[PDB]
Design an enzyme around this catalytic site. Structure first.
Site, short mmCIF file in Angstrom:
data_model
loop_
_atom_site.label_atom_id
_atom_site.label_comp_id
_atom_site.label_asym_id
_atom_site.label_seq_id
_atom_site.Cartn_x
_atom_site.Cartn_y
_atom_site.Cartn_z
CG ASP F 43 -4.36 10.94 -0.89
OD1 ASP F 43 -3.95 11.92 -1.18
OD2 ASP F 43 -4.56 9.97 -1.86
C1 LIG Z 1 12.13 1.75 -9.51
C2 LIG Z 1 11.61 0.69 -8.65
C3 LIG Z 1 10.40 -0.14 -9.54
C4 LIG Z 1 9.16 0.38 -9.07
C5 LIG Z 1 8.36 0.19 -7.98
C6 LIG Z 1 7.47 -0.96 -8.11
C7 LIG Z 1 6.04 -0.81 -7.17
C8 LIG Z 1 4.74 -1.12 -7.84
C9 LIG Z 1 3.59 -0.32 -7.47
C10 LIG Z 1 2.54 -1.16 -7.61
C11 LIG Z 1 1.52 -0.84 -6.26
C12 LIG Z 1 0.61 -2.40 -6.02
O1 LIG Z 1 0.63 -3.41 -6.77
S1 LIG Z 1 0.22 -2.42 -4.29
C13 LIG Z 1 -1.67 -2.42 -4.08
C14 LIG Z 1 -1.87 -1.23 -2.78
N1 LIG Z 1 -2.88 -2.04 -1.97
C15 LIG Z 1 -3.84 -1.15 -1.41
O2 LIG Z 1 -3.75 -0.08 -1.64
C16 LIG Z 1 -5.01 -1.43 -0.69
C17 LIG Z 1 -5.38 -0.82 0.91
N2 LIG Z 1 -5.20 0.53 0.50
C18 LIG Z 1 -5.03 1.43 1.57
O3 LIG Z 1 -5.04 0.97 2.51
C19 LIG Z 1 -4.99 2.93 1.01
O4 LIG Z 1 -5.93 3.12 0.10
C20 LIG Z 1 -3.66 3.15 0.89
C21 LIG Z 1 -3.27 3.10 -0.64
C22 LIG Z 1 -2.64 2.59 1.87
C23 LIG Z 1 -3.56 5.13 1.10
O5 LIG Z 1 -4.05 5.12 2.29
P1 LIG Z 1 -3.62 6.71 3.05
O6 LIG Z 1 -5.16 7.71 2.63
O7 LIG Z 1 -3.36 6.73 4.60
O8 LIG Z 1 -2.48 7.46 2.35
#
Ligand SMILES: CCCCCCCCCCCC(=O)SCCNC(=O)CCNC(=O)[C@H](O)C(C)(C)COP(=O)(O)O
Ligand SMILES: CCCCCCCCCCCCCCCCCC(=O)OC[C@H](COP(=O)([O-])OCC(O)COP(=O)([O-])OC[C@@H](COC(=O)CCCCCCCCCCCCCCCCC)OC(=O)CCCCCCCCCCCCCCCCC)OC(=O)CCCCCCCCCCCCCCCCC
Ligand SMILES: CCCCCCCC/C=C/CCCCCCCC(=O)OC[C@H](COP(=O)(O)OCCN)OC(=O)CCCCCCC/C=C/CCCCCCCC
Ligand SMILES: CCCCCCCC/C=C\CCCCCCCC(=O)OC[C@H](COP(=O)(O)OCCN)OC(=O)CCCCCCC/C=C\CCCCCCCC
Ligand SMILES: CCCCCCCC/C=C\CCCCCCCC(=O)O[C@H](COC(=O)CCCCCCC/C=C/CCCCCCCC)COP(=O)(O)OCCN
Lengths: 111, 459, 124, 175, 62, 88, 220, 104, 128, 67, 178
Positions: F43
């Site tokens: 992925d």
């Molecule tokens: C040190 C800094 C702090 C830490 C950073 C904080 C970040 C927090 C992380 C939390 C994430 C969320 O909440 S955000 C939640 C993310 N939203 C979704 O995933 C909905 C749609 N998903 C898709 O389109 C695909 O499954 C996809 C995932 C793109 C993959 O696609 P590929 O197959 O093309 O790779």
């Protein structure tokens, strides 16, 4: 007569020779960095002598050799002070500069 | 001193009697010879001036200016023979005639022993400069510039003439020696105040003062290269020479009357130094730098102390040379790129190394690097002002910082960085431009070797 | 530290002022005080050109050390007895200064306590 | 040497101590001084001897100019330009000589400071007193003339000073 | 040619400087000024020959 | 002296070295032209991790744009070759 | 002058104990040393300040050269977070950096002792501002605090540089220059301190808790 | 100009400007050799508060330590000849007040 | 949850923290498409001249000329005397002059009064 | 000398650099120990700090709250 | 730096860029490799927790909160590669990149040196001059009437042509010219 003045002025004068030679056919070759390093080394070992004279007899001097200009009662001349601070800091600075140039001959090899 | 005046009046017909392809060579050679001859006036008595005849005399203040003008003419000839290549023979001869007439008028101005003759020649210098600016410029604004360069002068200098003749009706003479020996104090009255204003305003607008400087950027930008050289190097010093000659009778009214002019000069020096930072043009920056330096010279002349006079003379000579060199350096880039924008051509050090070196040296001498005569004059003026008042240093100090900033700013904008990626007509520097740069820069160092020649009569 | 803590956090009147000191006569509680002896005369100190801060009552050992350092130049480790003597004389001067400080402190506290006792007695 | 006069620029008799070593280690500065002598001082001495030999074969004299004494500005008529010119030239020459006198005193003071080492504050305060007197006199002579100075301005300043002194003396006599 | 660099970069400048200092700078008064050498009780002055006296027999404690 | 004149063979060798050492890829199934999505089963996050591993291995960062479109080892080695100006 | 030096050295050390760029760390180090020099000037000890200049030049130049050698070895990388175990990969530069850091921190008999120890002793026993003295002591602690950070992050642990190892220091120029500065930073302090005349009255009578306070703060 | 994308293929990479697009009125101020308006990890009005608090506290602590100085429990230094009257300026024709130091 | 980051003039809001991009709309997509089209057309116009082997000279950028003209010569024709402009001009052009005049006049008056009284310590002021 | 890369292997060292580094560290430690053995006072002090409280009242010249 | 951008970034592109930035800053925080691997695996699990979300509004809100949290928890001094826009050697060698057209201004005595190189340069110049007209014709044929809609360029289609606008891309000075 009193080699203190002659040596103290020579250690500063011979540092300018490569600057004057920066136009001859030594500045366009690859021997220039070694030439400058050797000049600095010679200046350091020459300046080691007035330091010895001072640490022996505590000799300090001022040399007002060239009279530049006089504005009314004020006079401005080329005067050098050769007290403890100068005769002690010149050899240290020359030693450090020699080491840094030797290091730079390797660090800046691709410049 | 006709041994210098006559060879110029002989340069005229020989220029008009030369072959079509040999005018520049003859003009340059004989102008250099005339400058070498005029170099003989530097032998000045410490007691009094050299009085050759009843009309012409030379002082320790006049000789450096004469040498500067006679040295200037060959440099202007060298710089002018690039954009005039496509011109016809008659118009080239006319241009050289204008330059020769301007030099002759300047030479006879700097040595006239009578104030009315000095005024006559100091105004006769207007015609050739105006003709050059309005005939051999490049843009459509030149005409407007010329108008300014005329009227800003004349409206400030027409009253002076009246004052002059009025003095001749009261004291009985206008000869400088008689004026100095028979000088008497001026009482505090409205009549004397307006006499002071009339005698001062012409040279104030010829510096120019901060409030009357609007003509200088226009004149220095829309003029050709030689016009800019002669305007920024010698034509500005006419006001300073006139003030230094005329302040003898103005005492003791000067001490009361100098406050507004001193305030204007200081604050305008700060303002123009600040303006130089946010400039999109290249020649305007040099023009405003000239304004700042001339404001410093005005302060030096106004405080009226021997150290201030020495610093004023040194700064005048140094600024003339440095501004001339900077204008030539800008003109080379303008000829390369055919535009005056500063950020158009960038990173020229990787393409023109020797020109980058010349730019660096000119910028260093512009920001008063020791032991150049620029710093000598600036420091003498600063010390005199500090003796005048201990707060002035603040303003002076501020200017210094700003000065360095804008200078290096220019040196960083045009020389450092990366090239513009789409200017492919930057040919290697010719021998003429490098020779012009060297002939501009070497006299500065040679003078800083022996500064007493350019310190004026108070030395 | 402890003197600073006592002076700034406790009673300031019970502790000496380092700026204005001594504030008591030099013969208050002493029946006889011998004048402090200076060995080197002014001319010798002037000729040796020690400093304006090294010309204390300790200058004789300093002059001797400078001389012996000058004659024995090439070997710089031959001056240990003279250096130790100069250091000992400096230490004696420092302990004399500490003695003066302590004397002034306890003299001030004794004077204040005596004044308080006299006032209490005169209260009746 | 014999070039300058020893009374205009005085110096102490230069007492220097004798070497009294207390170690058997070879003193290095003595060897270095001997090497410097034998390697530098002799060739330059020979060159100077040759140059002085060449100079002695052709010697000529230059004379110091001596100026007459002309009437000063106090005995000058108000509108007689020639006498005023002569007085002004003489006054300017006197001003230059006065400045050079101040220069000589300042050079003496600088030698005072440098030569006496650490005890300069006490040894040669006489030079400080001489410079104070000379500077006060020079100030009272040419302090506030400013640029465009002349003999008439100096005379006017002197007249004002003498008037103030006379008024002060007359007021003090009434105490 | 083994050590001509020393004679062309050290010997010539020191010769020139020594000549210029000895016969031109020294010829003018108050140009090269040296601080007076330190005199201690015991040394003998060269020119005069006088010997400075000992400093008052100060007491010692082992 | 400095680094040797990096070649295409070395670039490909190092890229395959890091990729076949990845624990989500069978070392006996991946080739030079092996697509990540098609015949490897990965992925977008795995491709991002692979790009970061390439950046750490070669000591230079590939921008987020131009990294979304390096989908096989051949593309990665070609991009590195174009940026580093290698001949063979 | 004393207040300016104290605030400068304290602020610069506090900024140094956090930086990740090695050149930035040594730049803040030399800025803190300059602040200490100005503190020494402010307590009327100019000769101690000059001696500190002379001693500091040696080991600070050597430390910068060691940092430059490390940078050149790891393909011009300056972040300490990407330099791992160089204790055995670069032995000579490791030795030189350790000796230079120990001299900088005030190792009781290196070239940085005859200056820093005397400076701290003079500051302790002078009629000076208490706050300036406190800031000077805290900066003395923070000096060792950032020095050990440099050593730990640059030479200890496991490697973190790119896998292609180009670590090579067998070049006579670098070795000779670092060797000369190492001999200097080891012996020049003792040589110079014992060859100049006494230019100040030394502090001879000191409490034990104040004589060794520099060592206490450095170890802490 | 610093906030502009560095990975874009600008016509002028140093100035980060494309050919023909409108130019900011204050470009020469924002040329990224100059005033920078990039986002900060710590918000404004928080860096200002922290820095002003630090500098004000440092100044106040320096002032309060000036009026609460630190010294050693020692007396004034003693100098032999009337606190070196002749060497501290001189005036040898005034016979100053004697300064006598006694043993203790 | 977490302390909010508030932008300022000299520290602007990051793109990733801007609500203006998460609130998508077909109008915003059309606007972005038009902006990209304009930029691409300008880039093509630049690149066609840039890679032309025949041309030798400076590519005249109308945007740079327009910027310089607006900054230099288009200011006075678009100037109107308004209370804001009048007040700002009067202040910034007169107030500093009067302030400096008052400061220097006060200093020099104090100095001249001290000179007249005779208490200034003017010794060694040979040069002025 | 010619040194080749390693690519995830320990770099090829040399006997010369190792012996140089070991010798310089050893001489530094030897100098430190020698200086501490000969000039320990410079770390520990040479003269004792007197106790001001343990000075008898008589040598400071005071009277026992009598006069 | 090579591929032309788009008018906007999709949700997938935004979340991938956030993932890469978060991993880089976490590696900056976790200096050692094992700790970095631990927390990178935790971060990957956190991202994969909402992998199959289909509510676009909820996904957008999650991305917004994640980016706010990242901005709060970002490293003040993140690690930057030496030749990156923030690196210590970003534009170090831009002063050595001399454009090729400068060689046209060399003196004939300078061009006497390196004859073969200048012959090859003449061949390249001839090729560029010959291909320019076909390049411009293909560019004018393969575009909509309202100009290009994107910055991308077409390739060479027939065997006899070269890709349009290729001269200044092919003739870049070097990565390390001197
Ligand atoms: C040190 C800094 C702090 C830490 C950073 C904080 C970040 C927090 C992380 C939390 C994430 C969320 O909440 S955000 C939640 C993310 N939203 C979704 O995933 C909905 C749609 N998903 C898709 O389109 C695909 O499954 C996809 C995932 C793109 C993959 O696609 P590929 O197959 O093309 O790779
Ligand atoms: C103290 C030094 C002693 C030196 C002894 C010899 C002195 C010779 C002086 C010659 C006259 C100056 C010539 C200037 C024009 C340049 C000519 C040129 O193009 O050369 C190309 C030539 C060939 O190079 P290239 O490969 O073709 O170059 C390609 C690129 O252009 C790349 O070129 P580049 O990158 O090599 O650039 C040129 C180079 C050098 O070019 C320049 O910058 C020239 C301008 C110098 C500074 C100008 C501003 C300051 C003005 C000070 C005025 C002092 C007057 C002294 C008398 C001058 C008499 C002429 O740039 C610099 O070095 C940096 C410039 C800034 C220097 C800062 C110096 C501060 C003042 C120093 C103290 C001055 C007084 C000392 C005594 C004080 C009392 C004890 O290279 C040189 O000749 C370099 C010259 C050596 C540098 C001299 C720097 C110091 C000069 C000070 C004045 C002379 C002092 C003499 C008394 C003893 C001291
Ligand atoms: C008395 C004279 C006035 C005193 C000075 C006050 C400030 C003067 C105004 C400064 C003019 C600046 C504008 C013109 C210069 C161009 C702008 C410029 O230099 O660019 C900013 C450039 C970029 O910043 P970087 O961090 O390097 O970014 C790198 C990452 N990309 O940074 C600078 O150079 C800014 C420098 C401005 C300094 C202003 C602050 C100085 C104030 C000092 C007060 C304390 C005095 C000390 C007292 C000592 C005790 C006796
Ligand atoms: C080198 C090759 C030549 C070698 C043969 C010569 C050997 C030495 C013999 C030289 C002859 C003696 C001599 O030098 O003559 C003195 C002669 C002038 O005499 P004065 O009276 O002292 O000065 C004029 C004011 N009255 O001195 C000289 O001009 C030559 C030596 C001067 C010093 C060297 C130049 C250093 C200064 C360069 C300029 C620096 C900027 C200005 C200085 C700023 C100081 C505040
Ligand atoms: C770039 C533009 C600059 C313009 C500057 C122009 C202003 C110059 C200053 C005024 C010039 C006119 C002064 C007259 C010339 C001097 C002659 C003189 O001194 O005679 C006076 C006469 O003085 C006058 O009559 C002056 C009258 C002024 C009339 C014209 C006014 C012009 C504008 C006034 C303000 C200008 C001053 C400030 C301008 C600053 C620049 C903007 C004495 O009269 P007596 O006959 O001798 O009798 C006295 C004994 N019972």
């Amino acid at each position: 007569m009193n080699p203190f003045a002659s040596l103290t002025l020579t250690t500063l004068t011979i540092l300018t020779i490569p600057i004057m030679m920066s136009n001859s056919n030594i500045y366009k070759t690859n021997l220039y960095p070694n030439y400058v390093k050797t000049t600095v080394s010679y200046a350091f070992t020459l300046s080691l002598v007035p330091l010895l004279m001072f640490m022996h007899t505590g000799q300090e001097m001022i040399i007002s050799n060239w009279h530049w200009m006089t504005l009314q009662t004020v006079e401005l001349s080329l005067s050098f002070k050769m007290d403890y601070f100068s005769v002690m800091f010149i050899p240290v600075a020359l030693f450090v500069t020699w080491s840094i140039m030797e290091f730079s001959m390797w660090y800046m090899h691709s410049d | 001193m006709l041994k210098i005046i006559i060879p110029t009046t002989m340069l005229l017909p020989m220029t008009w009697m030369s072959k079509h392809n040999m005018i520049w060579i003859n003009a340059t050679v004989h102008s250099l010879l005339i400058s070498l001859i005029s170099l003989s006036l530097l032998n000045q008595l410490g007691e009094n001036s050299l009085n050759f005849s009843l009309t012409f005399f030379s002082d320790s203040l006049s000789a450096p200016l004469l040498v500067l003008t006679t040295w200037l003419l060959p440099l202007m000839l060298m710089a002018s023979q690039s954009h005039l290549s496509k011109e016809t023979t008659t118009r080239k001869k006319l241009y050289i005639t204008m330059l020769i007439l301007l030099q002759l008028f300047l030479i006879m101005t700097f040595t006239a022993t009578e104030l009315i003759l000095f005024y006559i020649l100091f105004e006769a210098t207007l015609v050739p400069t105006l003709i050059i600016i309005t005939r051999w410029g490049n843009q459509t604004e030149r005409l407007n510039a010329g108008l300014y360069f005329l009227f800003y002068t004349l409206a400030g200098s027409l009253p002076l003439l009246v004052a002059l003749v009025y003095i001749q009706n009261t004291t009985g003479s206008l000869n400088f020696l008689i004026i100095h020996y028979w000088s008497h104090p001026l009482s505090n009255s409205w009549s004397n105040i307006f006499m002071w204003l009339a005698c001062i305003m012409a040279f104030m607008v010829k510096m120019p003062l901060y409030g009357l400087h609007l003509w200088l950027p226009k004149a220095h930008v829309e003029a050709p290269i030689a016009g800019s050289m002669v305007l920024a190097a010698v034509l500005l010093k006419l006001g300073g020479y006139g003030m230094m000659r005329i302040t003898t009778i103005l005492n003791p009214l000067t001490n009361y009357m100098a406050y507004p002019f001193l305030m204007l000069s200081m604050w305008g020096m700060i303002m123009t130094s600040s303006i130089c930072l946010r400039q999109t043009d290249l020649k305007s920056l040099i023009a405003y730098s000239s304004v700042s330096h001339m404001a410093l010279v005005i302060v030096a002349i106004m405080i009226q102390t021997p150290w201030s006079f020495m610093g004023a003379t040194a700064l005048m000579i140094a600024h003339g040379l440095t501004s001339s060199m900077l204008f030539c350096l800008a003109n080379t880039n303008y000829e390369r790129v055919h535009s005056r924008t500063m950020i158009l051509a960038r990173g020229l050090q990787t393409l023109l190394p020797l020109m980058a070196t010349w730019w660096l040296v000119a910028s260093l001498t512009n920001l008063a690097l020791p032991p150049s005569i620029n710093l000598i004059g600036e420091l003498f003026i600063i010390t005199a002002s500090f003796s005048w008042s201990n707060i002035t240093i603040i303003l002076m100090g501020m200017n210094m910082m700003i000065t360095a900033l804008y200078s290096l700013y220019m040196l960083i904008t045009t020389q450092r960085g990366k090239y513009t990626h789409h200017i492919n007509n930057i040919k290697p520097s010719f021998t003429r431009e490098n020779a012009l740069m060297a002939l501009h820069i070497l006299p500065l160092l040679l003078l800083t070797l022996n500064p007493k020649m350019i310190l004026g009569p108070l030395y | 530290g402890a003197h600073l803590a006592r002076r700034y956090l406790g009673d300031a009147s019970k502790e000496p002022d380092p700026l204005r000191m001594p504030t008591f006569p030099p013969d208050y509680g002493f029946p006889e005080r011998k004048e402090r002896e200076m060995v080197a005369t002014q001319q010798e100190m002037n000729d040796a050109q020690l400093m304006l801060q090294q010309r204390d009552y300790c200058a004789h050992y300093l002059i001797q050390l400078l001389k012996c350092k000058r004659d024995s130049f090439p070997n710089f480790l031959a001056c240990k007895h003279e250096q130790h003597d100069w250091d000992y004389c400096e230490h004696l001067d420092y302990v004399k200064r500490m003695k003066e400080f302590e004397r002034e402190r306890r003299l001030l506290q004794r004077k204040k306590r005596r004044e308080q006792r006299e006032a209490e007695m005169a209260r009746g | 040497p014999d070039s300058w006069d020893k009374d205009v620029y005085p110096e102490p008799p230069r007492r220097t101590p004798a070497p009294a070593p207390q170690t058997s280690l070879p003193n290095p500065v003595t060897y270095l001084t001997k090497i410097f002598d034998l390697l530098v001082d002799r060739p330059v001495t020979l060159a100077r001897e040759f140059i002085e030999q060449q100079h002695a074969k052709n010697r000529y004299y230059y004379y110091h100019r001596e100026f007459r004494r002309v009437p000063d500005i106090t005995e000058c008529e108000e509108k007689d330009i020639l006498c005023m010119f002569e007085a002004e030239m003489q006054w300017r020459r006197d001003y230059k000589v006065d400045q050079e006198i101040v220069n000589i005193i300042q050079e003496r003071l600088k030698a005072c400071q440098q030569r006496e080492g650490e005890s300069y504050r006490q040894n040669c305060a006489k030079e400080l007193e001489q410079f104070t007197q000379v500077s006060k006199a020079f100030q009272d002579r040419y302090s506030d003339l400013g640029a465009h100075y002349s003999a008439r301005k100096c005379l006017a300043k002197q007249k004002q000073r003498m008037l103030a002194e006379r008024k002060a003396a007359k007021e003090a006599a009434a105490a | 040619r083994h050590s001509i660099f020393a004679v062309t970069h050290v010997l010539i400048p020191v010769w020139i400087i020594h000549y210029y200092l000895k016969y031109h700078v020294t010829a003018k008064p108050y140009t090269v000024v040296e601080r007076k050498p330190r005199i201690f009780p015991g040394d003998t002055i060269l020119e005069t020959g006088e010997v400075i006296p000992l400093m008052k027999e100060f007491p010692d404690q082992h | 002296s400095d680094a040797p004149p990096l070649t295409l063979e070395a670039i490909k060798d190092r890229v395959l070295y890091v990729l076949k050492l990845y624990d989500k890829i069978d070392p006996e199934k991946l080739s030079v032209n092996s697509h990540f999505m098609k015949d490897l089963g990965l992925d977008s996050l795995d491709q991002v991790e692979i790009i970061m591993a390439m950046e750490d291995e070669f000591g230079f960062e590939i921008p987020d744009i131009d990294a979304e479109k390096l989908m096989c080892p051949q593309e990665i080695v070609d991009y590195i070759a174009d940026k580093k100006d290698v001949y063979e | 002058t004393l207040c300016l030096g104290a605030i400068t050295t304290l602020f610069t050390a506090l900024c140094a104990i956090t930086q990740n760029d090695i050149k930035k760390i040594v730049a803040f180090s030399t800025s803190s040393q300059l602040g200490l020099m100005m503190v020494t000037i402010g307590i009327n000890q100019p000769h101690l300040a000059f001696l500190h200049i002379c001693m500091h030049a040696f080991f600070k130049a050597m430390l910068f050269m060691c940092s430059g050698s490390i940078i050149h070895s790891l393909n011009d990388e300056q972040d300490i977070r990407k330099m791992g175990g160089l204790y055995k990969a670069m032995p000579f530069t490791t030795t030189a950096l350790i000796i230079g850091s120990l001299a900088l921190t005030g190792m009781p008999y290196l070239t940085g002792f005859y200056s820093k120890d005397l400076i701290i002793e003079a500051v302790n026993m002078s009629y000076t501002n208490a706050w300036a003295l406190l800031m000077t002591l805290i900066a003395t602690s923070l000096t060792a605090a950032y020095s050990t950070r440099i050593i730990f992050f640059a030479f200890l642990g496991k490697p973190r540089f790119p896998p292609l190892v180009l670590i090579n220091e067998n070049n006579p120029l670098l070795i000779n220059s670092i060797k000369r500065l190492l001999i200097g930073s080891i012996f020049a302090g003792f040589i110079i301190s014992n060859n100049i005349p006494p230019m100040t009255v030394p502090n001879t009578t000191m409490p034990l808790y104040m004589k060794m306070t520099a060592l206490i703060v450095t170890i802490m | 100009q610093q906030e502009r994308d560095p990975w874009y293929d600008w016509d002028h990479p140093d100035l980060r400007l494309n050919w023909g697009e409108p130019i900011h009125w204050d470009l020469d101020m924002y040329i990224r050799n100059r005033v920078d308006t990039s986002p900060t990890p710590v918000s404004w009005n928080t860096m200002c508060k922290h820095l002003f608090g630090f500098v004000a506290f440092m100044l106040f602590m320096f002032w309060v330590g000036e009026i609460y100085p630190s010294y050693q429990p020692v007396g004034p230094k003693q100098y032999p000849y009337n606190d070196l009257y002749l060497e501290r300026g001189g005036d040898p024709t005034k016979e100053p007040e004697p300064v006598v130091h006694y043993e203790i | 949850s977490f302390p909010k980051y508030k932008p300022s003039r000299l520290a602007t809001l990051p793109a990733t923290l801007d609500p203006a991009e998460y609130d998508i709309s077909p109008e915003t997509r059309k606007a972005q498409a038009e902006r990209l089209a304009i930029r691409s057309r300008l880039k093509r116009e630049y690149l066609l001249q840039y890679n032309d082997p025949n041309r030798l000279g400076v590519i005249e950028d109308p945007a740079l000329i327009r910027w310089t003209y607006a900054r230099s010569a288009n200011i006075y024709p678009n100037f109107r005397p308004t209370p804001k402009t009048s007040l700002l001009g009067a202040l910034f052009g007169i107030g500093p002059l009067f302030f400096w005049y008052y400061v220097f006049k006060t200093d020099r008056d104090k100095k001249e009064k001290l000179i007249q009284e005779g208490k200034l310590d003017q010794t060694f002021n040979i040069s002025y | 000398v010619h040194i080749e890369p390693r690519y995830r292997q320990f770099p090829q060292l040399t006997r010369s650099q190792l012996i140089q580094a070991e010798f310089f560290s050893a001489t530094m430690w030897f100098w430190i120990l020698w200086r501490f053995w000969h000039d320990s006072d410079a770390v520990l002090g040479h003269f004792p700090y007197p106790d001001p409280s343990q000075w008898t009242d008589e040598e400071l010249g005071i009277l026992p709250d009598d006069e | 730096a090579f591929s032309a951008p788009a008018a906007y970034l999709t949700h997938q592109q935004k979340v991938l860029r956030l993932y890469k930035r978060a991993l880089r800053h976490l590696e900056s925080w976790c200096v050692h490799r094992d700790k970095y691997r631990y927390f990178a695996c935790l971060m990957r699990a956190r991202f994969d927790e909402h992998k199959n979300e289909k509510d676009m509004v909820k996904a957008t809100q999650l991305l917004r909160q994640a980016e706010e949290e990242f901005w709060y928890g970002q490293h003040p001094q993140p690690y930057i590669f030496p030749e990156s826009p923030g690196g210590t050697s970003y534009e170090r060698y831009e002063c050595y990149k001399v454009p090729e057209w400068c060689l046209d201004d060399w003196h004939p005595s300078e061009k006497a040196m390196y004859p073969d190189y200048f012959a090859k340069r003449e061949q390249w110049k001839r090729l560029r001059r010959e291909s320019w007209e076909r390049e411009v014709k293909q560019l004018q044929e393969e575009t909509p009437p309202g100009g290009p809609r994107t910055e991308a360029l077409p390739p060479a289609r027939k065997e006899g042509d070269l890709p349009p606008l290729w001269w200044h891309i092919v003739t870049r000075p070097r990565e390390r010219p001197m």
